[PDB]
């Protein structure tokens, strides 16, 4: 009982997230709570081998004195993914948080 590679490739083409938002608490609860930054556009490529990767880097402006510990992907708003950042960061002043690249997998 498992999806074939063709099934995964067909499946991933429907997930089309286009914005990313950061949080200081895990958005596994109500996803719109504890929002810390404005949404930033993000693009993804075609699914190959059941995996999609971000096309380019994304720069997110962290408001001064804010903290970021988690993130979530949004579409037409529905949050499709959530996760925790590699390290909780305390932006004592305004700064830039860089997402080099993020991928979604079915394996």
């Amino acid at each position: 009982g498992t999806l074939t590679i063709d099934g995964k490739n067909k499946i991933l083409a429907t997930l089309t997230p286009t914005t990313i938002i950061l949080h200081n608490v895990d958005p596994t609860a109500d996803p719109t709570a504890n929002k810390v930054t404005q949404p930033v556009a993000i693009y993804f490529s075609e699914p190959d081998n059941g995996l999609i990767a971000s096309e380019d880097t994304v720069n997110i402006t962290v408001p001064a004195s804010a903290t970021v510990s988690h993130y979530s992907l949004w579409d037409n708003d529905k949050c499709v993914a959530t996760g925790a950042l590699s390290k909780p960061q305390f932006f004592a002043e305004e700064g830039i948080y860089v997402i080099s690249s993020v991928s979604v997998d079915l394996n």
Partner: protein, 45 residues
């Protein structure tokens, strides 16, 4: 002179996600099936 300046603190990360999958299926070799009507029968030619 001795001078100092300030810059914006920049950080980078690698967030990625994955899901996984499963499949299931159940059955058996059939016999008789199920019928609402079930009575003794006689079959002439």
């Amino acid at each position: 002179r001795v001078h100092s300046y300030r810059g914006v603190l920049i950080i980078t990360d690698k967030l990625s996600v994955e899901a996984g999958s499963r499949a299931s299926l159940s059955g058996y070799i059939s016999d008789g099936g199920t019928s609402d009507v079930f009575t003794i029968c006689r079959l002439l030619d």
